[PDB]
Design an enzyme around this catalytic site. Structure first.
Site, PDB file in Angstrom:
ATOM      1  N   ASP A  51       0.873  -1.196   0.000  1.00 39.31           N
ATOM      2  CA  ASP A  51       0.000   0.000   0.000  1.00 39.31           C
ATOM      3  C   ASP A  51       0.904   1.238   0.000  1.00 39.31           C
ATOM      4  O   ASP A  51       1.817   1.344   0.823  1.00 39.31           O
ATOM      5  CB  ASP A  51      -0.901  -0.018   1.266  1.00 39.31           C
ATOM      6  CG  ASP A  51      -2.128   0.846   1.105  1.00 39.31           C
ATOM      7  OD1 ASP A  51      -1.964   2.085   0.743  1.00 39.31           O
ATOM      8  OD2 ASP A  51      -3.266   0.281   1.413  1.00 39.31           O
ATOM      9  N   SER A 102      -7.139   4.166  -0.801  1.00 44.28           N
ATOM     10  CA  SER A 102      -6.970   2.742  -0.889  1.00 44.28           C
ATOM     11  C   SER A 102      -8.238   1.984  -1.258  1.00 44.28           C
ATOM     12  O   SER A 102      -8.171   0.883  -1.779  1.00 44.28           O
ATOM     13  CB  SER A 102      -6.373   2.151   0.410  1.00 44.28           C
ATOM     14  OG  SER A 102      -4.976   2.584   0.556  1.00 44.28           O
ATOM     15  N   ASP A 153      -9.721  -2.905   7.032  1.00 48.83           N
ATOM     16  CA  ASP A 153      -9.142  -1.794   6.278  1.00 48.83           C
ATOM     17  C   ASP A 153      -9.413  -1.993   4.770  1.00 48.83           C
ATOM     18  O   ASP A 153      -9.681  -3.108   4.323  1.00 48.83           O
ATOM     19  CB  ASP A 153      -7.623  -1.652   6.584  1.00 48.83           C
ATOM     20  CG  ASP A 153      -7.054  -0.321   6.122  1.00 48.83           C
ATOM     21  OD1 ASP A 153      -7.788   0.716   6.075  1.00 48.83           O
ATOM     22  OD2 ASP A 153      -5.845  -0.296   5.797  1.00 48.83           O
ATOM     23  N   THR A 155      -7.902  -2.215   1.767  1.00 47.23           N
ATOM     24  CA  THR A 155      -7.253  -3.154   0.879  1.00 47.23           C
ATOM     25  C   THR A 155      -7.779  -4.601   0.917  1.00 47.23           C
ATOM     26  O   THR A 155      -8.217  -5.150  -0.137  1.00 47.23           O
ATOM     27  CB  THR A 155      -5.715  -3.033   0.992  1.00 47.23           C
ATOM     28  OG1 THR A 155      -5.343  -1.647   0.984  1.00 47.23           O
ATOM     29  CG2 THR A 155      -5.093  -3.665  -0.264  1.00 47.23           C
ATOM     30  N   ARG A 166     -15.727   3.149   3.362  1.00 48.77           N
ATOM     31  CA  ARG A 166     -14.722   2.302   3.975  1.00 48.77           C
ATOM     32  C   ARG A 166     -14.727   2.428   5.519  1.00 48.77           C
ATOM     33  O   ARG A 166     -14.165   1.609   6.202  1.00 48.77           O
ATOM     34  CB  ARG A 166     -13.333   2.682   3.414  1.00 48.77           C
ATOM     35  CG  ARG A 166     -12.907   4.080   3.837  1.00 48.77           C
ATOM     36  CD  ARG A 166     -11.518   4.490   3.274  1.00 48.77           C
ATOM     37  NE  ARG A 166     -10.431   3.688   3.840  1.00 48.77           N
ATOM     38  CZ  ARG A 166      -9.176   3.814   3.427  1.00 48.77           C
ATOM     39  NH1 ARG A 166      -8.882   4.672   2.446  1.00 48.77           N
ATOM     40  NH2 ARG A 166      -8.177   3.141   4.038  1.00 48.77           N
ATOM     41  N   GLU A 322      -1.196  -8.239   1.345  1.00 51.06           N
ATOM     42  CA  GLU A 322      -0.896  -6.798   1.433  1.00 51.06           C
ATOM     43  C   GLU A 322       0.134  -6.415   2.509  1.00 51.06           C
ATOM     44  O   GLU A 322      -0.045  -6.805   3.667  1.00 51.06           O
ATOM     45  CB  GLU A 322      -2.156  -6.013   1.809  1.00 51.06           C
ATOM     46  CG  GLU A 322      -1.848  -4.527   1.762  1.00 51.06           C
ATOM     47  CD  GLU A 322      -2.864  -3.633   2.447  1.00 51.06           C
ATOM     48  OE1 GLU A 322      -3.697  -4.129   3.286  1.00 51.06           O
ATOM     49  OE2 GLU A 322      -2.885  -2.382   2.226  1.00 51.06           O
ATOM     50  N   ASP A 327       2.315   2.362   3.397  1.00 45.92           N
ATOM     51  CA  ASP A 327       1.488   3.571   3.291  1.00 45.92           C
ATOM     52  C   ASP A 327       1.334   4.262   4.645  1.00 45.92           C
ATOM     53  O   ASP A 327       1.434   5.481   4.724  1.00 45.92           O
ATOM     54  CB  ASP A 327       0.058   3.162   2.786  1.00 45.92           C
ATOM     55  CG  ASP A 327      -1.007   4.284   2.876  1.00 45.92           C
ATOM     56  OD1 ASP A 327      -1.192   5.086   1.943  1.00 45.92           O
ATOM     57  OD2 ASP A 327      -1.723   4.284   3.905  1.00 45.92           O
ATOM     58  N   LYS A 328       1.029   3.483   5.699  1.00 44.23           N
ATOM     59  CA  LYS A 328       0.704   4.124   6.980  1.00 44.23           C
ATOM     60  C   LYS A 328       1.884   4.880   7.578  1.00 44.23           C
ATOM     61  O   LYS A 328       1.699   5.965   8.172  1.00 44.23           O
ATOM     62  CB  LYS A 328       0.172   3.070   7.956  1.00 44.23           C
ATOM     63  CG  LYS A 328      -1.111   2.377   7.413  1.00 44.23           C
ATOM     64  CD  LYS A 328      -1.609   1.289   8.384  1.00 44.23           C
ATOM     65  CE  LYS A 328      -2.745   0.416   7.743  1.00 44.23           C
ATOM     66  NZ  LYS A 328      -4.013   1.271   7.465  1.00 44.23           N
ATOM     67  N   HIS A 331       2.478   8.033   5.665  1.00 43.99           N
ATOM     68  CA  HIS A 331       1.573   9.105   6.155  1.00 43.99           C
ATOM     69  C   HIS A 331       2.178   9.701   7.423  1.00 43.99           C
ATOM     70  O   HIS A 331       2.062  10.919   7.666  1.00 43.99           O
ATOM     71  CB  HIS A 331       0.173   8.582   6.556  1.00 43.99           C
ATOM     72  CG  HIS A 331      -0.734   8.324   5.401  1.00 43.99           C
ATOM     73  ND1 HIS A 331      -1.220   9.306   4.563  1.00 43.99           N
ATOM     74  CD2 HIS A 331      -1.260   7.154   4.964  1.00 43.99           C
ATOM     75  CE1 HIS A 331      -2.032   8.725   3.641  1.00 43.99           C
ATOM     76  NE2 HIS A 331      -2.110   7.412   3.817  1.00 43.99           N
ATOM     77  N   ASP A 369      -1.281   0.300  -4.659  1.00 44.09           N
ATOM     78  CA  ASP A 369      -2.592   0.857  -4.938  1.00 44.09           C
ATOM     79  C   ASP A 369      -2.509   2.301  -5.451  1.00 44.09           C
ATOM     80  O   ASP A 369      -3.335   2.700  -6.277  1.00 44.09           O
ATOM     81  CB  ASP A 369      -3.482   0.758  -3.696  1.00 44.09           C
ATOM     82  CG  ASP A 369      -2.872   1.396  -2.467  1.00 44.09           C
ATOM     83  OD1 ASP A 369      -3.687   1.728  -1.518  1.00 44.09           O
ATOM     84  OD2 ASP A 369      -1.649   1.645  -2.455  1.00 44.09           O
ATOM     85  N   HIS A 370      -1.492   3.075  -5.057  1.00 53.48           N
ATOM     86  CA  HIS A 370      -1.317   4.477  -5.463  1.00 53.48           C
ATOM     87  C   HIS A 370       0.057   4.917  -4.990  1.00 53.48           C
ATOM     88  O   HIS A 370       0.731   4.153  -4.232  1.00 53.48           O
ATOM     89  CB  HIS A 370      -2.396   5.422  -4.845  1.00 53.48           C
ATOM     90  CG  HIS A 370      -2.533   5.283  -3.368  1.00 53.48           C
ATOM     91  ND1 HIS A 370      -1.574   5.720  -2.484  1.00 53.48           N
ATOM     92  CD2 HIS A 370      -3.390   4.516  -2.634  1.00 53.48           C
ATOM     93  CE1 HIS A 370      -1.820   5.183  -1.275  1.00 53.48           C
ATOM     94  NE2 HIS A 370      -2.899   4.402  -1.257  1.00 53.48           N
ATOM     95  N   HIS A 412      -1.262  11.060  -0.210  1.00 51.69           N
ATOM     96  CA  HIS A 412      -1.050  10.196  -1.380  1.00 51.69           C
ATOM     97  C   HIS A 412      -0.696  11.079  -2.556  1.00 51.69           C
ATOM     98  O   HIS A 412      -1.001  12.277  -2.584  1.00 51.69           O
ATOM     99  CB  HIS A 412      -2.344   9.517  -1.761  1.00 51.69           C
ATOM    100  CG  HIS A 412      -2.834   8.556  -0.748  1.00 51.69           C
ATOM    101  ND1 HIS A 412      -4.034   7.896  -0.879  1.00 51.69           N
ATOM    102  CD2 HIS A 412      -2.264   8.086   0.395  1.00 51.69           C
ATOM    103  CE1 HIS A 412      -4.187   7.051   0.133  1.00 51.69           C
ATOM    104  NE2 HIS A 412      -3.125   7.143   0.928  1.00 51.69           N
TER     105      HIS A 412
END
Ligand SMILES: [Co+2]
Ligand SMILES: [Co+2]
Ligand SMILES: [Co+2]
Ligand SMILES: [Co+2]
Ligand SMILES: [Co+2]
Ligand SMILES: [Co+2]
Lengths: 449, 449
Positions: A51, A102, A153, A155, A166, A322, A327-328, A331, A369-370, A412
């Site tokens: 992610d 996501s 979550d 994903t 979500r 995943e 990602d987390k 962030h 995912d991005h 993102h």
């Protein structure tokens, strides 16, 4: 059986200060790529998602962990590569929204339809679409959903839940944010309730907290979702010993592993990046997180266990894995946490490729995912955001910058990013493609109706 | 018909809000990719470099000019794609320097050796290494060096000059900054002097300013570098009419197109991004630069003429074409300038692919020297750097952010980035490779012995 090659080495071959020493290739690749092309059926698919793992995140992790001229034996070893687009849609206008979350992106590869940020398994008109996992199961294939995030979550949830937001983890949040999906209002239920209905053969990750909620209607009204899982025949495990002890997973005894209350623990600890962190502070060396433990299965261990259990299905299987916290941590502007979760994913990718190369009819795909915030910048950078210097495997300093948010979380980004593949039908990730092409690629490779 | 296919259309195939409407693929790609693989000799090579054109820059320009589900007929049309690394070296330690400048990276693909930032055609020991252009000429092939930058600038200068600092444009700069290279000190001279010595067949771009200088020594002491060029048989053009009147370019008649005193004009104008510009200022629609001209050849025009003139050589030719100002506009935090120069490069790539597809023995490579600052972010982003909202072809807003420098210029970034190819030996850019591998790939495809 060896037929299609997995790349054995793309590290710099010699002395990077000398002519030819930084070369990653040792000879022409035309024949190796021809040997990598097969249009026979994929009996199995293993899709690995990092992610937020854009090209920048891959490079930064490789530079720190393996050296600039190093090589990820998993992530960098897929021979067929391309770049894909993952824009979402504005819900009201239907026009592109250039930076997805996501949920809309996982919905795109799992259903073949673009959607709005925060949607899971539904399109911009909130209409449900079947997911590649629901389709695989319907065709008699075994199915696995593995993640280091809470299982509710975006994903992992996109494969088994159809909700308009979500945020609808359990009954309480669904009643407040997705009234149309709430079980007591006649809907299909929360993400956790729909996951229990989907009944994949193997589901492993965090997110035990929501299972303490109780259902508001239906056969298991008043019981916790954990009690519901038990009454419905699920084998529940909560640690590495519990997981290792499992000998089978199928529709009669599906496996549900809940390894943490929320997200699973990250591999590495380090401080958060700070304003002029690369000018004002000393360099950081990452360190292993004590909370990991032999009692918590690693992502590579969960992947191997899922493969062993799903491979018992003669017809084949679909597995999504995943590495959620890349990602987390991106962030949270935390290079060590981010890089450690990328190294974690590389181990799972290696397990997948080891299996695929031996089995010979397995398509493995690795992508994100991005894209995300982190950027690798000059050591003397004087940036407006959060930066940090890191001591890499090369014995040199690398500086990472997070410069797209004054808010508590970095953002993102919309750049197209790497998608790589190995195995039957891998040609379909080469060149420019869209994230929704991945749904169709997986559907066709498996020969789904 | 051309055996090796050029991607015809990978735009979204229909209604992006409908299932499958955003797919870029219409069916399986295994056969098309098999048809794209050949290891026959490359008779010609055309290398197109978008300075600073990382995946983010390609995506932002596609989103704005063609729409998110749009397709660059040039840039996006090469079928074989990978991701390559471009880290440079610390001169003193020899360890990797994770973010390269244009000089070290252009040295890497033109010589096959990694070097320190600012170095042109030399290694960290200040030792010269032959460039792919010098080698092409020595072998009897025609040579072209085209750029929208000053011809003394790093990208085109790396193919013909060996200096210890990219700042050594002419005699003055060289005597003070590269004493060891100064002609009156026994060296090979300034970048412009070495360029005149290298004498490629076709050299087109800006930078006429430095030619006003006069040699401090040598055979043309006292004469201006331009007087010197005229004195050495060079055919000098300075506008579009004079250029598209040339019928031949060779060793006794080398062509030197100097179309501007410094950099050539960019295609599009727009406001520079600003603090909270996506929040505080209206969305921007880019404007055509009225001073870009019709008497100034476009990149596509310079590319086409170079191709016409170099292809008369039966042995073959090597040509490098640089869309140089993508990078320069990214440094200036100017989305319109940046995107317009990417659109400009796409036009040049279309000319190269159209020629290569007809010719059948031409390898075309499209990539960048390093990544850059620009990021695509959510419309409501509150970032600490410079941002701007843009009105895209989709009729939706895209926001771009430049957040890695409080200084006057935005910073390069170290992320690996897309490299794509078409033609003989194009398999060698697939998967993970290094920028120095590109030197070996070009040398070997031409069979330079
Ligand atoms: Co994500
Ligand atoms: Co996720
Ligand atoms: Co995120
Ligand atoms: Co550059
Ligand atoms: Co340049
Ligand atoms: Co630059």
């Amino acid at each position: 059986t060896p037929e299609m090659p997995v790349l054995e080495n793309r590290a710099a071959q010699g002395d990077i200060t000398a002519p030819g020493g930084a070369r990653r290739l040792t000879g022409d690749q035309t024949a190796a790529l021809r040997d990598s092309l097969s249009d026979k059926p994929a009996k199995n698919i293993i899709l690995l998602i990092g992610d937020g793992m854009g090209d920048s995140e891959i490079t930064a992790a490789r530079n720190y962990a393996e050296g600039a001229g190093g090589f990820f034996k998993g992530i960098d070893a897929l021979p067929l590569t391309g770049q894909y687009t993952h824009y979402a849609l504005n819900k009201k206008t239907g026009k592109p929204d250039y930076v997805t979350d996501s949920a809309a992106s996982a919905t795109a590869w799992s259903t073949g339809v673009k959607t709005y940020n925060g949607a899971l398994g539904v399109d911009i008109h909130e209409k449900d679409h079947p997911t590649i996992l629901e389709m695989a199961k319907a065709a008699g294939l075994a199915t696995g959903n593995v993640s280091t995030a809470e299982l509710q979550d975006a994903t992992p949830a996109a494969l088994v839940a159809h909700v308009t937001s979500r945020k609808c983890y359990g009954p309480s949040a669904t009643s407040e944010k997705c009234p149309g999906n709430a079980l007591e209002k006649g809907g299909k239920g929360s993400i956790t309730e729909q996951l229990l209905n989907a009944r994949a053969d193997v589901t492993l990750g965090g997110g035990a907290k929501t299972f303490a909620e109780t259902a508001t209607a239906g056969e298991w009204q008043g019981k916790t979702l954990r009690e519901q899982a038990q009454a419905r025949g699920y084998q529940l495990v909560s640690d590495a010993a519990s997981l290792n002890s499992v000998t089978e997973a199928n529709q009669q005894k599906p496996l549900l592993g809940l390894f943490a209350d929320g997200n699973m623990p990250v591999r590495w600890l380090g401080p958060k990046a700070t304003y002029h962190g690369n000018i004002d502070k000393p360099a950081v060396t990452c360190t292993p997180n004590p909370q990991r433990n032999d009692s918590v299965p690693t992502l590579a261990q969960m992947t191997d266990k899922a493969i062993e259990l799903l491979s018992k299905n003669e017809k084949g299987f679909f597995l999504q894995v995943e590495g959620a916290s890349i990602d987390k941590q991106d962030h949270a502007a935390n290079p060590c946490g981010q890089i450690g979760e990328t190294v974690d994913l590389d181990e799972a990718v290696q397990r997948a490729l080891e299996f695929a190369k031996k089995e010979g009819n397995t398509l493995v795909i690795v992508t994100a995912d991005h894209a995300h915030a982190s950027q690798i910048v000059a050591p003397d950078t004087k940036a407006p955001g959060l930066t940090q210097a890191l001591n890499t495997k090369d014995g040199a300093v690398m500086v990472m910058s997070y410069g797209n948010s004054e808010e508590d979380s970095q953002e993102h980004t919309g750049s197209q990013l790497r998608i790589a593949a190995y195995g039957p039908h891998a040609a379909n990730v080469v060149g420019l493609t869209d994230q929704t092409d991945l749904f169709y690629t997986m559907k066709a490779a498996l020969g789904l109706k």
